[PDB]
Every structure is written in C-alpha cells, then in structure tokens.
mmCIF file with all atom_site columns, C-alpha atoms in Angstrom:
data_model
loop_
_atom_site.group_PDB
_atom_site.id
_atom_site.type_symbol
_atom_site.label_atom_id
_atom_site.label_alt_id
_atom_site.label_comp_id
_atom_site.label_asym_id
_atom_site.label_entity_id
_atom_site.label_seq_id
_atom_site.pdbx_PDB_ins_code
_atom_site.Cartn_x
_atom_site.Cartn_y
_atom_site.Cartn_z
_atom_site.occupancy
_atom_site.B_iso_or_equiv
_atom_site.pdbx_formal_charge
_atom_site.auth_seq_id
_atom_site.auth_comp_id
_atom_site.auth_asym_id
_atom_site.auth_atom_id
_atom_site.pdbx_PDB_model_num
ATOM 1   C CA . UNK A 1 1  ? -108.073 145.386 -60.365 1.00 0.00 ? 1   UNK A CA 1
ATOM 2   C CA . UNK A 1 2  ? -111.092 143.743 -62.281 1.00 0.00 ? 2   UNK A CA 1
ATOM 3   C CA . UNK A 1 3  ? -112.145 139.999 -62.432 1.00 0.00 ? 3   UNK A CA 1
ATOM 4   C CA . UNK A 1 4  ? -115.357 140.621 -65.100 1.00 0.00 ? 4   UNK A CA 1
ATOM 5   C CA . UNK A 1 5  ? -112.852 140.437 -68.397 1.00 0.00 ? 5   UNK A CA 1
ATOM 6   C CA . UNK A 1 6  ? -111.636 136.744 -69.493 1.00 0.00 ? 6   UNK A CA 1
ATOM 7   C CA . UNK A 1 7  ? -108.343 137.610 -70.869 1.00 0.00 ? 7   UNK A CA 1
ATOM 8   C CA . UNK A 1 8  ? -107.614 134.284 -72.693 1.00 0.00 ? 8   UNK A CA 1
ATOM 9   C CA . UNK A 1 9  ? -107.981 135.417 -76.421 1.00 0.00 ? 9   UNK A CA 1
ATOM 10  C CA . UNK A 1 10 ? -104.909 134.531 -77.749 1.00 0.00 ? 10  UNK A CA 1
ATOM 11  C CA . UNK A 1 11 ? -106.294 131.125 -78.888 1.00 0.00 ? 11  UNK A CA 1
ATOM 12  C CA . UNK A 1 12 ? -108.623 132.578 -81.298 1.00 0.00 ? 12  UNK A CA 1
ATOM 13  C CA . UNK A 1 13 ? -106.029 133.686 -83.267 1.00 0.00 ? 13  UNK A CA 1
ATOM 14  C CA . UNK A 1 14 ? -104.495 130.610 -83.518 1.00 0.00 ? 14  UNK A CA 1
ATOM 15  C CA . UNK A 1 15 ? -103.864 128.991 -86.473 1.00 0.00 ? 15  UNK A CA 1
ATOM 16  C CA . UNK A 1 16 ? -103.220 125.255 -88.016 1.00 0.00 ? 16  UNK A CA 1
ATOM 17  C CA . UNK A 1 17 ? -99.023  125.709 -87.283 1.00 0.00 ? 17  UNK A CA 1
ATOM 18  C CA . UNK A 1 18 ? -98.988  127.586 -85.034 1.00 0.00 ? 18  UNK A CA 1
ATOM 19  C CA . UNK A 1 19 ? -98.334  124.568 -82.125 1.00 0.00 ? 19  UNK A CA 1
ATOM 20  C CA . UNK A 1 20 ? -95.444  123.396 -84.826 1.00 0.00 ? 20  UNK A CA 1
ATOM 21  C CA . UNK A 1 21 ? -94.379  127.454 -85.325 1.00 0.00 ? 21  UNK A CA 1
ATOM 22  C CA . UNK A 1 22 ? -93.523  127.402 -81.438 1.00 0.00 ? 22  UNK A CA 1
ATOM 23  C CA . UNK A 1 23 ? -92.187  123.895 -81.332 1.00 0.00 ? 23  UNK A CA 1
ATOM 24  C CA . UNK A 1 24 ? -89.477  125.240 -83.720 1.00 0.00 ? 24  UNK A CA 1
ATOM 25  C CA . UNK A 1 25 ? -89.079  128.850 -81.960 1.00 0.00 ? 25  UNK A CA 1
ATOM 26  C CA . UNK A 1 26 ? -88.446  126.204 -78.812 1.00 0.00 ? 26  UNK A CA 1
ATOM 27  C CA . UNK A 1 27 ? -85.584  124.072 -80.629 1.00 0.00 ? 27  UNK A CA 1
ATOM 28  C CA . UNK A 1 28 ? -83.386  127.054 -80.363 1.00 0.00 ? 28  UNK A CA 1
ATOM 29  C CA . UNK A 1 29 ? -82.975  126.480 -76.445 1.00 0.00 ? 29  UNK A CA 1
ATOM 30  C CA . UNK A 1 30 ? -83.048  122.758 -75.992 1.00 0.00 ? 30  UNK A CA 1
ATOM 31  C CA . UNK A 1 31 ? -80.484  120.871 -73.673 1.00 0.00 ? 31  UNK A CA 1
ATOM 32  C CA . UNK A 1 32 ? -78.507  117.954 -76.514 1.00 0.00 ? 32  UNK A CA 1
ATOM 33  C CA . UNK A 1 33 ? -80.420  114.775 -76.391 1.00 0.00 ? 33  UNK A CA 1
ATOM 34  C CA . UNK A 1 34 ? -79.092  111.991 -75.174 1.00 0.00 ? 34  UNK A CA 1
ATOM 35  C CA . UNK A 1 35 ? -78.097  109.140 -77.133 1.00 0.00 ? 35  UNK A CA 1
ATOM 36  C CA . UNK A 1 36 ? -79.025  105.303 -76.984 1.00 0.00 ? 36  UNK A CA 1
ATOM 37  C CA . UNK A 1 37 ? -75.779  104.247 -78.765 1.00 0.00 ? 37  UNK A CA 1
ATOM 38  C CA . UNK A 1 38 ? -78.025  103.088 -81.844 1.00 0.00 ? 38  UNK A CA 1
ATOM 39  C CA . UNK A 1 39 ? -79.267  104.756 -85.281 1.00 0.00 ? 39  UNK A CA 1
ATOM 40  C CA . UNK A 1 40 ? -82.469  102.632 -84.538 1.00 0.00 ? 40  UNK A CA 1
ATOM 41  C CA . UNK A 1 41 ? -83.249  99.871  -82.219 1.00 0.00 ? 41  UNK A CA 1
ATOM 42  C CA . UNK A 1 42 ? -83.086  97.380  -85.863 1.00 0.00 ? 42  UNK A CA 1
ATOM 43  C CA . UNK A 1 43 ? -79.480  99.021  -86.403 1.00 0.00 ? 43  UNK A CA 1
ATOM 44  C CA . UNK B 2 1  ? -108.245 51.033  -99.837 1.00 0.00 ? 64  UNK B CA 1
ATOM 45  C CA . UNK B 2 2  ? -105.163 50.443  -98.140 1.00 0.00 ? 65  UNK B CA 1
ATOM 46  C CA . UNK B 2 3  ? -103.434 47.030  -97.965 1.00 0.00 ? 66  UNK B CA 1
ATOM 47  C CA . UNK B 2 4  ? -100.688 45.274  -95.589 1.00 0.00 ? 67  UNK B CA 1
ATOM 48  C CA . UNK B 2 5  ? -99.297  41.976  -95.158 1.00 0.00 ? 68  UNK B CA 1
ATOM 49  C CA . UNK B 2 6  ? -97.675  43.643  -91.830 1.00 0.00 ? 69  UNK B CA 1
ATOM 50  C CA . UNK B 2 7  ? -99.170  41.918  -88.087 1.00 0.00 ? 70  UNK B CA 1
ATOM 51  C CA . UNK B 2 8  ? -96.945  44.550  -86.541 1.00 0.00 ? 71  UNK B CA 1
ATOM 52  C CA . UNK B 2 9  ? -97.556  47.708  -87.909 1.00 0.00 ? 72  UNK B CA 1
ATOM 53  C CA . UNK B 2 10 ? -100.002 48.542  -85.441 1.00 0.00 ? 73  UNK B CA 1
ATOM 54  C CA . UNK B 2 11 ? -98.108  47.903  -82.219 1.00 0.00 ? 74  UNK B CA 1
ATOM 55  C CA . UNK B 2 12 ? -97.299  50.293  -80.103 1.00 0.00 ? 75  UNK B CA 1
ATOM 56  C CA . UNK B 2 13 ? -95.837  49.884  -76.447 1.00 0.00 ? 76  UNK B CA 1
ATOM 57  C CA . UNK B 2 14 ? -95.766  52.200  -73.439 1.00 0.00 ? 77  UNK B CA 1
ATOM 58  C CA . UNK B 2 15 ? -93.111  52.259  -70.905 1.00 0.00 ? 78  UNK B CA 1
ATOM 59  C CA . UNK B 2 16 ? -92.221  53.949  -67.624 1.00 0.00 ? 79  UNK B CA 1
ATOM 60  C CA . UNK B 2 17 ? -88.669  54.734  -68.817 1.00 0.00 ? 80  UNK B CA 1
ATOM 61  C CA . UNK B 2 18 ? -86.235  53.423  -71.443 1.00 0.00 ? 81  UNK B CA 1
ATOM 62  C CA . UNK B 2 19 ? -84.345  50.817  -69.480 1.00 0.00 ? 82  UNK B CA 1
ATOM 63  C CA . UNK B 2 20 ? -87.793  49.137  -69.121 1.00 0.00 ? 83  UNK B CA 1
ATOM 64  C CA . UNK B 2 21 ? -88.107  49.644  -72.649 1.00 0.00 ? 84  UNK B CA 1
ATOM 65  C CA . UNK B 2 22 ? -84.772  48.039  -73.324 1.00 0.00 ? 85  UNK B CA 1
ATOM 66  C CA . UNK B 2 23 ? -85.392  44.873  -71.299 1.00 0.00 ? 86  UNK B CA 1
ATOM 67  C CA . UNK B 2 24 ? -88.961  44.005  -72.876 1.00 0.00 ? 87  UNK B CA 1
ATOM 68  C CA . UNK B 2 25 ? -87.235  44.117  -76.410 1.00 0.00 ? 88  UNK B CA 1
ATOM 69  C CA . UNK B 2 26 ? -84.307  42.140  -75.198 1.00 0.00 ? 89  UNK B CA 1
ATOM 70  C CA . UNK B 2 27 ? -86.238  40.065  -73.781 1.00 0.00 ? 90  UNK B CA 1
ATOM 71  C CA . UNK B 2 28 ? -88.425  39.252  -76.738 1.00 0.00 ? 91  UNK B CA 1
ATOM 72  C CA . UNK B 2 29 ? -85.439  39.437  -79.123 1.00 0.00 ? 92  UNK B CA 1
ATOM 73  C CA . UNK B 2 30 ? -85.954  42.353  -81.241 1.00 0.00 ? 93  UNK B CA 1
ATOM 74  C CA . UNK B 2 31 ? -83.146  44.446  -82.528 1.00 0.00 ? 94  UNK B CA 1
ATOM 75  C CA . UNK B 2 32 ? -83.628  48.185  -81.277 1.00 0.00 ? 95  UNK B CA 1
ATOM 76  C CA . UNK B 2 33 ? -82.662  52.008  -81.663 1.00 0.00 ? 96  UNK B CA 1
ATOM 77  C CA . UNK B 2 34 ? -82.689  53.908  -78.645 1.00 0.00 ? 97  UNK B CA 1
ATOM 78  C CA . UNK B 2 35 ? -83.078  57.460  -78.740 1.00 0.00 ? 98  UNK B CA 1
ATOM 79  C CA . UNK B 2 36 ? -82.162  59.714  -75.769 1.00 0.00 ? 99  UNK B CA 1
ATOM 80  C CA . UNK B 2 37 ? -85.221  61.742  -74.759 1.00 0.00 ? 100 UNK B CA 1
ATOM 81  C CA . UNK B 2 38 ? -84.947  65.555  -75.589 1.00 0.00 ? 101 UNK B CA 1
ATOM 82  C CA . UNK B 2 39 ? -86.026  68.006  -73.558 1.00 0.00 ? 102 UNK B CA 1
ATOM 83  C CA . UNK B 2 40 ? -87.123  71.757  -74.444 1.00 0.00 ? 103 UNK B CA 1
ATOM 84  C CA . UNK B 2 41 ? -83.735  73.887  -72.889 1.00 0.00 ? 104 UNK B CA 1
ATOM 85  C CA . UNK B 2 42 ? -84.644  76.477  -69.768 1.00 0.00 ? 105 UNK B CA 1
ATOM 86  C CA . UNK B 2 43 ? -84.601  79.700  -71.501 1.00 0.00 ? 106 UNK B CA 1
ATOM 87  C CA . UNK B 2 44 ? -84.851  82.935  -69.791 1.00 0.00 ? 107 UNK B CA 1
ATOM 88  C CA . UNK B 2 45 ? -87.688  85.421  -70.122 1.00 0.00 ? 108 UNK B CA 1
ATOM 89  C CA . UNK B 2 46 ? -88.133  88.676  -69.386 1.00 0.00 ? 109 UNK B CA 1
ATOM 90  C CA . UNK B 2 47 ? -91.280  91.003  -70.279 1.00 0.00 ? 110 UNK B CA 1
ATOM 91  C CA . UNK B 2 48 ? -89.363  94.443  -69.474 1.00 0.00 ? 111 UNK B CA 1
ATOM 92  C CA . UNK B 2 49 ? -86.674  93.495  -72.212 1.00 0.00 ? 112 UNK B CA 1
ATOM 93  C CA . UNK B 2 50 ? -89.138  94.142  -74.769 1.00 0.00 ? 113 UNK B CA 1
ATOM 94  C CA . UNK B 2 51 ? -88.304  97.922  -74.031 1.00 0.00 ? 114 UNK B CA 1
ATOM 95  C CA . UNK B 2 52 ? -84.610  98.123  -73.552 1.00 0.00 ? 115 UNK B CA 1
ATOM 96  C CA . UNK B 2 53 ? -83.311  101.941 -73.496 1.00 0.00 ? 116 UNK B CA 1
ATOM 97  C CA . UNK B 2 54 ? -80.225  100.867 -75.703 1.00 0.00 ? 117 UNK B CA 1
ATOM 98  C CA . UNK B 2 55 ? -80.920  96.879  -76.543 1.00 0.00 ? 118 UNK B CA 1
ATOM 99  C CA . UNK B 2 56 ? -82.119  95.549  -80.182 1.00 0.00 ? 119 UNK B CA 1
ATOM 100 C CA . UNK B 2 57 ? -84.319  93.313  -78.041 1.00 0.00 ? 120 UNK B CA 1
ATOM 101 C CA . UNK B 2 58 ? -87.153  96.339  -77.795 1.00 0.00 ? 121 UNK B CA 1
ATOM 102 C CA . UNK B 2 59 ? -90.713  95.133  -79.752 1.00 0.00 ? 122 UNK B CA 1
ATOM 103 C CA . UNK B 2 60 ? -91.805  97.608  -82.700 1.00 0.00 ? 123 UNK B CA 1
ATOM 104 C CA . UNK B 2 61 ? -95.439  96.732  -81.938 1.00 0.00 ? 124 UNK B CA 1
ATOM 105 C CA . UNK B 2 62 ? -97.354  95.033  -79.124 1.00 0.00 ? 125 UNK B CA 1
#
C-alpha cells in the first residue's frame, strides 16, 4: 500500500491521434446503429 | 408635377362590413366589384418539429 506516488502518467505520452487511434480500436465492438429511414434529413 | 382632371380619385370610404358597403353605393348609384375578404388560413405550428428523429422537417441551423 502507498498513497505518495500519482500514478496518472499515461497522458504524457499521449499524442495528437491518439483520442482518434482509440476511437477506431473502439469501432471493432460497437452495437449497429440505428437507422432514421433517411440518407440525410434533405434526402 | 402631377396633373388630374379626376374629383374622385381621392375618395376613399370606410365601412363596418360589406353589406353596408353595398347599400351606400346602391344607394348613390355607382356600379361596384365586391371582393370577398380573405383571411390568412390557421396553420399549425410546432417548435419540436424542427428536430424530427426521422422527418425532413428538422432545421440545419438555428
């Protein structure tokens, strides 16, 4: 046990994708979307 | 500047409601058009149609 070390450094290697990198690790698992019925609400 | 030989082209004439309206030019022996008064139609409005889930009504900017 020890509460003198902040763990959180994974930020500082973080880069400019790296939100974008996981967003497209994460579209692997994703329920289907749902549909409107539509191409676009001006279809 | 701007000439007329009209007396009348200045009249103008309020009534209450066209059968009034009717009777003074009768009356006075003028022939007359009636037109029927229009009236703007009731149209229904609705501010949460302007983001329909499925509906073209939805606004692309507000």
């Amino acid at each position: 046990f020890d509460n003198s070390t902040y763990r959180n450094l994974q930020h500082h290697e973080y880069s400019t994708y790296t939100f974008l990198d996981l967003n497209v690790e994460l579209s692997k698992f994703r329920m289907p979307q749902p549909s409107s019925g539509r191409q676009s609400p001006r279809h | 500047w701007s000439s007329t030989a009209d007396p009348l082209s200045n009249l103008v004439l309020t009534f209450s409601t066209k059968e009034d309206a009717v009777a003074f030019a009768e009356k006075n022996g003028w022939s007359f058009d009636v037109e029927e008064r229009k009236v703007p139609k009731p149209k229904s409005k609705s501010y949460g149609a302007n983001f329909s889930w499925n509906k073209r009504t939805r606004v692309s900017t507000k």
